[PDB]
Design a protein around this ligand. Structure first.
Ligand SMILES: [Zn+2]
Length: 186
């Protein structure tokens, strides 16, 4: 029931991203939630991020994790060491678009950044909610979801915001409206 509201908040974050011809403007919010029959009032925000918030070609989930790493004085690849890990609460990430499993640049894709939060005695991110089953990349597809499943990370599509998520995501693109159609038809 709170998922649509979190995704709208993710979309507001995405709107902070600079429109560019080749980026996908996405927002992400990391939440600590009680396991079981939880109450939304007990959710705690752990971090937020959006595309290109941090210098260079950075994705929303990447920035969300890197923001937390910076606040906790660790390199971003070591954010797993500092993310919350309490057995009765789980970490859930909301993100407007499906986390990428492949990138055009040489940068590590977002699903791999998510999977590596589960190391040692740290539970890591247990579930991803997103609003469109397309990644924030030109590659498209579902490879991110396949890798999450293979790694034991739950995911769930939250319907009802697809057009707005795509319109924001591709705002900087030359033929954005035609591209939004192609995605909505897919
Ligand atoms: Zn990504």
């Amino acid at each position: 029931s709170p998922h649509a509201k979190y995704l709208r908040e993710c979309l507001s974050l995405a709107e902070k991203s600079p429109p560019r011809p080749t980026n996908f403007r996405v927002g992400a919010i990391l939440v600590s939630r009680k396991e079981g029959d939880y109450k939304t009032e007990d959710d705690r925000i752990v971090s937020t991020g959006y595309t290109m918030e941090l210098a260079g070609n950075t994705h929303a989930e990447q920035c969300c994790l890197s923001n937390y790493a910076a606040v906790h004085s660790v390199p971003e690849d070591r954010v797993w060491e500092v993310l919350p890990s309490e057995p009765d609460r789980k970490l859930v990430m909301y993100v407007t678009m499906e986390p990428c499993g492949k990138r055009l640049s040489g940068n590590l894709p977002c699903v791999q950044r998510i999977i590596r939060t589960r190391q040692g005695d740290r539970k890591g991110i247990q579930k991803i909610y997103f609003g469109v089953k397309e990644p924030g990349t030109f590659v498209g597809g579902s490879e991110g979801c396949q890798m999450l499943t293979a790694a034991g990370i739950d995911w769930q599509v939250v319907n009802g915001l697809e057009r707005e998520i795509l319109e924001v995501a591709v705002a900087g693109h030359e033929n954005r409206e035609e591209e939004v159609k192609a995605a909505l038809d897919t």
